[PDB]
Amino acid sequence: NITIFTRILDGLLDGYDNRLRPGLGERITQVRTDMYVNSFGPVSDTEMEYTIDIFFAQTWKDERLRFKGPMQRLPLNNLLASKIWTPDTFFHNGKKSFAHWMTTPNRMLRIWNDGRVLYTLRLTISAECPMDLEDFPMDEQNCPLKFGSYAYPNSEVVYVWTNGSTKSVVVAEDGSRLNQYHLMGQTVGTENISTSTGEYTIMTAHFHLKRKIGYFVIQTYLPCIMTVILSQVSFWLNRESVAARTVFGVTTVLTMTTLSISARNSLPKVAYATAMDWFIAVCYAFVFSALLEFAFVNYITKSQPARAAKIDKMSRIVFPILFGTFNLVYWATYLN
Amino acid sequence: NITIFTRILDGLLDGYDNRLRPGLGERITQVRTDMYVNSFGPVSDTEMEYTIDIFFAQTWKDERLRFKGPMQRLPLNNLLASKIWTPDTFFHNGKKSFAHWMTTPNRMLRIWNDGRVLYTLRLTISAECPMDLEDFPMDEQNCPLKFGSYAYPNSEVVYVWTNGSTKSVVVAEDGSRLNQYHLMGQTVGTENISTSTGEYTIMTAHFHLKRKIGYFVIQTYLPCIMTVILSQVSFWLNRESVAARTVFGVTTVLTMTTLSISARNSLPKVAYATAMDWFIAVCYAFVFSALLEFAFVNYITKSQPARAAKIDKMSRIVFPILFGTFNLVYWATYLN
Amino acid sequence: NITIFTRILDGLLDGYDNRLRPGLGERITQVRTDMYVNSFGPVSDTEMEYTIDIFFAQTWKDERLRFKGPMQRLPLNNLLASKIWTPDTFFHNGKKSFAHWMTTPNRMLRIWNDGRVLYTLRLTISAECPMDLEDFPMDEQNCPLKFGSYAYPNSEVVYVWTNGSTKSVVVAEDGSRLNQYHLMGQTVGTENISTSTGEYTIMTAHFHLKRKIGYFVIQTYLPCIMTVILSQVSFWLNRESVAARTVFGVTTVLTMTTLSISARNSLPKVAYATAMDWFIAVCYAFVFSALLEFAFVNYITKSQPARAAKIDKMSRIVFPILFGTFNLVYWATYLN
Amino acid sequence: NITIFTRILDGLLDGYDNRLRPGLGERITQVRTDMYVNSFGPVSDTEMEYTIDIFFAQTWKDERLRFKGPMQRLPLNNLLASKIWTPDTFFHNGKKSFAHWMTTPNRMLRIWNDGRVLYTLRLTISAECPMDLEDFPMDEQNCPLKFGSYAYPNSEVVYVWTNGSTKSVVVAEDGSRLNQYHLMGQTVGTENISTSTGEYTIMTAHFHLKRKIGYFVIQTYLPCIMTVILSQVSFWLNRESVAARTVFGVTTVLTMTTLSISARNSLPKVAYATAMDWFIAVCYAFVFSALLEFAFVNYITKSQPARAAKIDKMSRIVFPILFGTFNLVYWATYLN
Amino acid sequence: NITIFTRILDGLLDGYDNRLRPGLGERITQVRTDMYVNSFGPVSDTEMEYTIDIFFAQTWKDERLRFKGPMQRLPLNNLLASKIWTPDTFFHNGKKSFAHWMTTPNRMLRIWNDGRVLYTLRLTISAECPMDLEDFPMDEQNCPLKFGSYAYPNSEVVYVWTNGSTKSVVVAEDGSRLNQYHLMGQTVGTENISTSTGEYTIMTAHFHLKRKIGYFVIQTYLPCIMTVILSQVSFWLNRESVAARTVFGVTTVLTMTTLSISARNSLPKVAYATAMDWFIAVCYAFVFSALLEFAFVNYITKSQPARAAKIDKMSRIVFPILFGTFNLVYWATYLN
Ligand SMILES: CCc1c(C(=O)OC)ncc2[nH]c3cc(OC)c(OC)cc3c12
Ligand SMILES: CCc1c(C(=O)OC)ncc2[nH]c3cc(OC)c(OC)cc3c12
Ligand SMILES: CCc1c(C(=O)OC)ncc2[nH]c3cc(OC)c(OC)cc3c12
Ligand SMILES: CCc1c(C(=O)OC)ncc2[nH]c3cc(OC)c(OC)cc3c12
Ligand SMILES: CCc1c(C(=O)OC)ncc2[nH]c3cc(OC)c(OC)cc3c12
Ligand SMILES: *[C@@H]1O[C@H](CO)[C@@H](O)[C@H](O)[C@H]1NC(C)=O
Ligand SMILES: *[C@@H]1O[C@H](CO)[C@@H](O)[C@H](O)[C@H]1NC(C)=O
Ligand SMILES: *[C@@H]1O[C@H](CO)[C@@H](O)[C@H](O)[C@H]1NC(C)=O
Ligand SMILES: *[C@@H]1O[C@H](CO)[C@@H](O)[C@H](O)[C@H]1NC(C)=O
Ligand SMILES: *[C@@H]1O[C@H](CO)[C@@H](O)[C@H](O)[C@H]1NC(C)=O
């Protein structure tokens, strides 16, 4: 009852060459690709890379594997994977991709009577996801995933997604778990590119990422906000207390300076200003401006004390209002 | 006396195909899995990963390997492991799993007369353990371990634990040694999942982790507690000592700010507030509030000195009581 | 219709030795090399290394592979790559080069009737790019890429670029994306080197890198510039305020000291002064000089107060002018 | 003269099965293990791991390899290593072990006429060495090294050290070079463990490590000791100098706080107090106590100045004596 | 014309055993080793390791490979490398050595009529170079490179350098490029070592390294030198300015303390004092001594003001002279 299967496998491999694609010189091989995301790994920001584990699956028609028998399907494993022809799919943006070999090489091969072949592989891709951090941290990132044939041009092998976008890409409920991102959705697309070696079809899958705020608020914004409030306390101290008010201005300014350096340590070394950078710069101006006001007041406190008192009293009201007004514009501008 | 064993091995391999599972088209293959944990490696927090070394073992029945001879068992090694059929078990949450090949590939194969097969493999799994750090550091983590067949659906290969939970999973006495965790216990479970490729049984093992406190107390809590006490010292200084009391308020506030940044450097970049974060925030309020009290007292020390003295004297008693009362509620709330 | 291809492949491999180069003892093998840069990876500064992913391609003539058939080309994959002779090309500056094996080893083999062979391979090279950081960050780097045969001297195998430089090297539009560099252009060259094992031709490709400024301005220059301005504020304070002006001088000097240490943390540990280092040193002099002026003024404020006031008033004007004048010379000198 | 050796090798491999241990079903295989330590790699503290390179050697008797010829020994290399049976030795505590393959796989095989076999392998073991840092840095660590058979129980394969302990383990003169440890000596032992798969003999080698002090003295103790002395300087300042003495107390307390955090950055995140931690805590009390004394003195300097002067004068003598006395007890307690 | 070469190769491999060294039982195999350094990689200080890329070459005589033909040499590649016998050379100090496999395994095999064989291999060695940092950074390091046979004792295989030292080791002009070292020269040597497995010849190559100063001057010495000068500024301030002079003493002392910790972060954790450590300690004494002088002066400024003024005036001259004198002795002592 089991010996029948062995004979069928031997017959298919008899006279079968794995170096030639099915339907060579008679038609164009068609491949259907479906992807299942086991887990969307962490999205490293500094290196512009993200790790993803998927069960990449490919389906194609091969008449050379047609067979007749009591069983309509032939489940198998990696043993027969190398004995037949398979597409030379590769990932363009994958900087370093490795497979899983334990406990057994994670590969499956299913063959039907008509000759249809299903081949699925488990992969871990450390792809590169360039990001435009103009609105960081209020930025949305669209990490793509490009793959295609390495040796067969568009005239020989063509990749097409199966059914709609929802069925083409599937993400596990627990797979989409990122500490500082939200997986809003996924999309797919196809395109052709002309090269010196010929035209090759490109299959691209895009993941919509919505960065979640809250870590930077507790890390960068709140220390800056409290620091600005600390500087304004000097406005409530007497002018003659030159030493006391000096500490607030000097300490606050230096505190903001180190926060900017510390804040960008995790941020990628991008050569442009981000939204957070402007917020820090504005906060730096307030603390720096407060010190200038104290110096100006202390400079004229002897010649015209009357105006000095008025400026100090006014500063107690103007500064808090401007800082509060700026926050509403800043948060509203990006949070909308 | 030794040549008899060689003939038996040759006979079993004669006409045996490793590409077909035992009992194909006649029944459903049943596999019994037992696990022994050599050492529960460190549980990295930042990357949500933990390393575990186990002696994964699988048992199944194969009638094709039945034999008769003086010896009731056939101890072997990895040499014959690849010559026969083995399940394509894999770990779903294993981000990167590698085997041990030195001195020899750590694999054993034992066969009995009835045809029962025992196959054990040594593995090192860098699995992912998502954690909800809402009660951190007073949090309990349940790291799972999911594995199953890659090519054989539930209708062909089924995994079941052997005997009770205690025998299914065994942990070495010295294996469970973590610097900041306690291995309270282990549990196992089984479930079915429906996918496009069919239904596959899932075997999950859960490890109960109870984080041990003491490192964060010496690292985060104690510096914060002493810092708050330092600020309250200013209440015992004369009001006219404006400069002296200014240093305490400014220095203490900045000290708390850097502690919050330093504390979360090791903590994962989670976008929500933890229990420790609230404690730091409350401590920040006390030191910040003390500075406000000094500023308010110094503002009215000229118009109504009588009330200024009363506020300063009262602050010496109210502040220590509130800080002490808060600790009892905080520690009692989580330590219970 | 497909069986014809199988016979052709068998005939070519019949009597073909892959250990002997084509045209041995009759002529000199000629190889044409064309490169396509999929993505120019990050250029690490500390380790003097850069990562590049390219589709390295080689073309050569082999009369032993001549064939006649209906199809003028024979697209193939890695299966036949090892069955024939290929050049032993290697990268001299490549510290650690690894290939991509997923989903399939990225290799293509195309053969024409005349016997011309096209062989392309995907590689990731962690080459070393020594840099002379004399004008850093206003420095231009020319990272080379040297490769050649390992066993065949110039008298047997010769590498030559195909057509012009533009066609020889091609860079993808999205491939050239660096956080702190601009890919101005590419150039190629050839040379011979004499060694104990014979003369070997060297193929070198140079990439022109123009570092983009803006990250260091927000990281190093701006904190230094503001720090210098902070020190000059002390010139507007009264001389008798010894304590108040002391804080500015001491704090500013220490702030510059830590910036220099922090600035070079990312910079490679080079044993020479860079352009940025001189800017920091000059800024350090201004803040340090301001403290000296205060000390000198405070030393003679009792004997000859008249001159002390004049020096303090003059310092308020001289110092800002010199710092501003220095910036124009510094920026103009390098930004030109 | 050389052809004789070839015939002998062919004869031994004729009818020899490498899947069966020598003396199967007739006796118990005995293996003698001798180890040579090429270099005891660094002992990482944070990860509780140490790297060691050894020339692991195993000797056993195999009657199937008996031969007669002019030469009494048959030096060989890795080529014949896989053609015969070898023990499946593995390291229990080895988290990740890799071999050396350059220039050639470092393996030797020597066979004598009687059939004795010598098999040595070079290995690099990243074993785990749990440490109890109760007396750190005055702590002695005993890193073990456990290995044994993976498939052959104690009833089939037994490991025994050769001759005495000195000959069993040999360490190169230059191999034992650690930056913060001393290799006092080595010891060996054997034991049996009962498991579900049977009883397996365990071979354990223990290395005696005596941590060398001097790095922490220049890194942690000395900064703390000088900081405490700095605080005591305030006792020599006038009481009315409230601001001057405030800086010493505040700055010293914060300096100790950062030292404790910095000190434990390299130390493993252990959830218990070490000997160094107590020393830091005691030093923190002295600096903190000095600030309290100043605050208490300044609080009563108006009502009863007479007692205030006495306390300040007494503090100048009591504090240095207590700090010096504590050091003698602390150093003597552990350095003995 | 090409078929002649194929026959010659087949004849040599006919009856040739790669498991037996040439001239076995008739003489002692002699191997000549020549090394070419493609690039001397970075010399990591913390891990006591350095990376080097070399074209290791070995030459030996094999009569079994004698042939007669029109061509006097047989250039080849890695294909035939494994088909013949090669020495089992290995590196003793190599902690982790890996080869280069792209584009092709970098191996060459050349055979002459007399039977001489040339075999060269490209290797990347992460060898260990212990360093005695007693005179750091004015220290000279001699990193060795030990290699030899793994299975053939001195009585069978002997390694000898070819010609003089200059020809034995060759370093590329651009290869010797280190950020903090100078490759003064190279030397070679041979020695015998007796072991339990027999006597094995050892080939050692030593590289003379002269650390280049300038990075530490801008990183450690200059901040310390300026800090000491900053402390001496307090000597020019009035005694009554207790608060002003307190800041200089406290801030400078703490600044030196953090520099010592920061300086040794890159330095290896060696348990002994280096030359730089003494310089920092001396600088610490000057700043600390200045604070003591101020405290002593302020203590007696009321009882005997006359002596207090003299001490302060004298300190302005003595301190700068001693610091300058110390530098001349320190720099001259090591820079000579
Ligand atoms: C142009 C690079 C290249 C080369 C080569 O070496 O060219 C010099 N050889 C074969 C190739 N197959 C490709 C398939 C592709 O799309 C799926 C593709 O898209 C980026 C590029 C190539 C490709
Ligand atoms: C759905 C992913 C998948 C695919 C594939 O490529 O689907 C597009 N192929 C074969 C597969 N065998 C599985 C067994 C499983 O459980 C043990 C399992 O659970 C997560 C998933 C798969 C699986
Ligand atoms: C001199 C190093 C060397 C050796 C060797 O071991 O020499 C002792 N053997 C074979 C070699 N083929 C080379 C080809 C080259 O250029 C493409 C080359 O350029 C740096 C060097 C070598 C080379
Ligand atoms: C109990 C783990 C185990 C298993 C397995 O999978 O058990 C479920 N299989 C085969 C085994 N051979 C061993 C030899 C040993 O000592 C040298 C040993 O000691 C820790 C354990 C095993 C072992
Ligand atoms: C003593 C270690 C050893 C062993 C072994 O396992 O001994 C227990 N076996 C074979 C060996 N061949 C060696 C060649 C050497 O020099 C080139 C050498 O020098 C350090 C050591 C060995 C060596
Ligand atoms: C790519 O080429 C194929 C050729 O059949 C064509 O059908 C398809 O529309 C092309 N795709 C695009 C995006 O142009
Ligand atoms: C999974 O499927 C099998 C089919 O035999 C069934 O016996 C078992 O109860 C199912 N498990 C669950 C959790 O539903
Ligand atoms: C290298 O050698 C070849 C020998 O044919 C010669 O044609 C070529 O001009 C040489 N190249 C250089 C740069 O000298
Ligand atoms: C282990 O078992 C063997 C069985 O022969 C016995 O000889 C030996 O004494 C046992 N060792 C220990 C430590 O019990
Ligand atoms: C090593 O042994 C050989 C044996 O022939 C001898 O010639 C050589 O001088 C010895 N080398 C040393 C350094 O003793």
DSSP C7-45: HHHHHHHTT--TTS-TTTTTS-EEEEEEEEEEEEEEEET
CA dihedral (A256, A257, A258, A262) positive or negative: positive
Residue E163: closest CA among C26, B74, C196 = C196
C-beta separation of A226 from A281 below 8 A: no
> Which candidate, E249, E318, E236, E242, places its Cα nearest to that of E287?
E249
In this structure, which long-range contacts are made by residues D304-308, counting pairs with CB atoms below 8 Å and at least 24 apart in sequence?
Answer: D308/D239
Copy the structure tokens of residue D10. Answer: 């062919």
Is A43 buried (19+), middle (13-18) or exposed (0-12) by CB count in 10 A?
Answer: buried
Cα four-point dihedral sign D67, D69, D75, D77 = negative
In whole angstroms, give the CA distance from residue D19 to residue B79. Answer: 7
CA distance D118 to D57: 7
Nearest to C238 by CA among C144, C333, C325, C312: C312
C233–A20: do the CB atoms touch at under 8 Å?
A: no
DSSP-derived letter for residue E16 is -
Contact (CB, 8 A) for E281 and E256 = no
C215-334 placed in CATH 1.20.58.390 = yes
Q: Is residue A29 classed as helix, strand or coil in its secondary structure?
A: strand
Coil, helix or strand at residue D130: coil
Do residues C152 and C100 lie in contact, with contact meaning Cβ atoms separated by under 8 Å?
no
Tokens of E182: 């100078």
A234, A237, A242, A245 alpha-carbon torsion, rounded to 10°:
-20
Give the C-alpha separation, C221 to E85, whole Å: 63
Tokens of C107: 């290799």
Q: Which helix (H) or strand (E) is B225 found in, with range?
A: helix B222-232
Ligand nearest to the CA of C158: 8
Q: What is the Cα–Cα distance from C273 to C282, expressed in whole angstroms?
A: 13
Please, is D139 exposed, middle or buried when counting C-beta atoms within 10 Å of its C-beta (0-12, 13-18, 19+)? middle
Determine the residue of chain C that is closest to A264 in CA distance.
Answer: C219
Question: Could you tell me the sign of the dihedral formed by the alpha carbons of B261, B262, B264, B269, in that order?
Answer: positive
For residue D103, say if its preceding peptide bond is cis, omega within 30 degrees of 0.
yes
Residue A204's closest CA among A218, A216, A220, A187? A187
Q: Which residue among E38, E42, E179 places its CB closest to the CB of C92? A: E38
Rounded to the nearest 10 degrees, how much is the dihedral formed by the CA atoms of A309, A313, A318, A319? 90
Most informative mutation of C192, C195, C204 for ligand 8 (most atoms within 8 A of CB): C192
Q: How does strand E169-171 pair with strand A94-99?
A: unpaired
Of C94, C93, C78, C43, give the one whose Cα is nearest residue C210. C43
Q: How far is CA A116 from the centre of its chain?
A: 35
Rounded Cα gap, residues B91 and A100, in angstroms: 9
Tell me which H or E stretch contains B329. Answer: helix B305-334
Distance from CA of B150 to the nearest CA of D (A): 26
Q: Are A156 and A21 in contact (CB under 8 A)?
A: yes
| CB-based pocket (< 6 A), ligand 3 | C 92, 148-150, 193, 195-197, 200, 202; E 34, 36, 55, 57, 108, 120
Sequence-distant (≥ 6) Cβ neighbours of residue B268 within 8 angstroms: A179, B45, B46, B48, B131, B133
Query: Experimental method used, please?
Result: cryo-EM
Most distant pair of Cα atoms in chain A: their distance: 112
Closest among B71, A281, E13 to D26, alpha carbons compared: B71
Ligand nearest to the CA of D189: 9
- Under 8 Å CB-to-CB from D208, ≥6 apart: which residues? D140, D142, D183, D184, D185, D186, D187
Contact C25 E71 (CB under 8 A): yes
Contact yes or no for D283/D256 (Cβ under 8 A): yes
Q: Which two tokens stand for residue E244?
A: 């002003």
User: Does E255 contact C254 at a Cβ distance shorter than 8 Å?
Assistant: yes
CA distance E143 to E49: 9
Strand bridging mode B116-128 / B49-61: antiparallel
Identity of the residue numbered D44: S
C-beta B154 within 6 A of ligand 7: yes
Q: Where are the beta strands (DSSP E) in C112-195?
A: 116-128, 140-143, 146-149, 157-161, 169-171, 182-195
Strand partners, E171: E37
| H/E element, E264 | helix E242-266
Which residue is closest to A108 within chain B, CA to CA? Answer: B151
Quick one: which atom of ligand 1 is closest to the CA of A90? 17
Cα–Cα nearest to D294, from D278, D268, D316, D277: D316
List the structure tokens of D161. Answer: 């050290």
Q: Helices (DSSP H) in chain C: which residue ranges? A: 3-13, 165-168, 215-216, 222-232, 242-266, 275-300, 305-334
- The DSSP output letter for C112 is B
By Cβ distance, the residue of A246, A257, A268 closest to C223 is A257
**Chains near E (3 or more Cβ pairs under 8 Å):** C, D
Q: Concatenated DSSP letters for B28-68?
A: -EEEEEEEEEEEEEEEETTTTEEEEEEEEEEEEE-GGG---
Q: Which helix (H) or strand (E) holds A329?
A: helix A305-334
Nearby residues of B304 by Cβ (< 8 Å), 6 or more positions away? none
CATH class of residue range D3-210: mainly beta
- Radius of gyration, CA atoms only, chain D: 32
Choose one of A192, A194, A195, A200 to mutate for the ligand 6 pocket test, by most ligand atoms within 8 angstroms of C-beta.
A192
Cross-strand pairs, C36: C170
- Using DSSP's 3-state secondary structure scheme, residue E132 falls into coil
Q: For residue C193, which atom of ligand 3 is closest to its CA?
A: 19
Task: Give the strand pairing for D29-44 and D49-61.
Answer: antiparallel
Rounded Cα distance between B268 and B44, Å, is 10
The protein residue with its alpha carbon nearest to ligand 6, atom 13, reads: A191
In this structure, are residues A209 and A182 in contact, taking their beta carbons and an 8 Å threshold?
yes
* Resolution of the structure, angstroms: 3.0
Residues B109 and C150: their CA atoms lie apart, in Å, by 45
User: Which residue from B24, B250, B296 is facing A247, i.e. has the nearest CB?
Assistant: B250
Task: Give Cβ neighbours of residue C15 (< 8 Å, ≥ 6 apart).
Answer: none
Q: Tokens representing C64?
A: 């032993």
Cα–Cα separations (whole angstroms), residue B46 to A176, B212, D45? 17, 17, 19
State in Å: Cα A192 to ligand 6 middle: 6
> Exposed, middle or buried: residue E234 (CB in 10 Å: 0-12, 13-18, 19+)?
buried
Touching D: B residues 77-106, CB under 8 Å: 77-80, 98, 100-106
The amino acid occupying position C25 is: G
Pick E219's closest partner by Cβ from C92, C246, C261: C261
- How many other CB atoms sit within 10 Å of the CB of residue A223? 25
Query: DSSP secondary-structure letter at C107?
Result: E
Sorted by sequence, the CB contacts under 8 Å of residue D195 that are 6+ apart come out as: B36
d(CA D310, CA D308): 5
CA separation for the pair A324, A313 (Å, rounded): 18
Integer Cα distance of C277 and C283 in angstroms: 10
| Segment 234-253 of chain C within 8 Å of chain A by CB | 236-238, 241, 243-244, 247-248, 251
Chain B contacts of A79, Cβ < 8 Å?
18-19
For B181, the token pair is 């965790």
A193 neighbourhood in chain C, CB within 8 Å: none
Chain E contact for C72, CB < 8 A? no
Dihedral, CA atoms, A212, A215, A218, A223, nearest 10 degrees?
Answer: -100
Ligand 2 atom with least separation from CA of B202: 17
Interchain pair E233, C86: CB under 8 A: no
Residues of E in contact with D42 (CB under 8 A): 47-48
The count of other CB atoms within 10 Å of the CB of residue A286 is 21
Residue of B192, B195, B200, B204 to test ligand 7 pocket, by largest number of atoms within 8 Å of CB:
B192
Neighbours of chain D (3+ CB pairs under 8 A): B, E
Q: Which of the residues C246, C251, C262, C277 would you substitute to probe the E interface, choosing the one with the greatest number of E C-beta atoms within 10 Å?
A: C246
From the list A70, A108, A237, the residue facing B295 with the nearest CB is A237
Residue C257 DSSP SS3: helix
Give yes or no for a contact between E122 and C90, defined as CB atoms under 8 angstroms apart: yes
Closest partner residue to B247 among A42, A230, A247, by Cβ?
Answer: A247
Whether C274 is in the pocket of ligand 8, judged by its Cβ within 6 Å, is: no
- Dihedral, CA atoms, C208, C214, C217, C218, nearest 10 degrees? -140
A202, two tokens:
């490109």
Local structure of residue A84 (DSSP, 8 states):
S
Task: Give the D window 49-68 contacts with B, CB below 8 Å.
Answer: 56
Rounded to the nearest 10 degrees, how much is the dihedral formed by the CA atoms of C43, C44, C47, C52? -40
Chain A residues 175-214 with CB within 8 Å of chain B: 177, 179-180, 212-214
My answer on whether omega of the bond before E86 falls inside 30° of 0, hence cis, is: no
Longest dimension (CA), chain D: 112
Q: What is the distance in angstroms between the Cα of B178 and the nearest Cα belonging to chain A?
A: 24
Interface test mutation site (partner A, options B146, B254, B278, max chain A beta carbons within 10 A): B254
d(CA E251, CA E234): 12
Helix (H) or strand (E) holding A248: helix A242-266
Alpha-carbon distances of E321 from A43, E307, E317, E318, rounded to whole Å? 58, 21, 7, 5
Q: Do D130 and B177 count as a contact with CB atoms less than 8 A apart?
A: yes
Mutate to test the interface with C, among A20, A82, A107, A133 (most CBs of C within 10 A): A20
Closest-approaching ligand to the CA atom of E28: 10
- The structure tokens listed for D85 are 């049976």
Q: Are B40 and B176 in contact (CB under 8 A)?
A: yes
The amino acid that residue B310 corresponds to is: K
Centroid of ligand 8 to alpha carbon of C192 (angstroms): 6
User: Contact at 8 Å (CB) between D141 and D209?
Assistant: yes
* Interface residue B215 vs chain D (CB under 8 A): yes
**Domain ranges within chain E, ordered by starting residue:** 3-210, 215-334
Residue B127 CB coordination number (10 Å): 21
Question: What is the rounded distance in angstroms from the CA atom of residue E99 to the CA atom of residue E89?
Answer: 14
SS3 E12: helix
Between chains, do A260 and C102 touch, taking CB under 8 Å as contact?
no
SS3 E328: helix
**Distance set, CA C270 to CA B29, D163, D182, E215 (Å):** 65, 54, 34, 6
Show the tokens assigned to B74: 């056939």
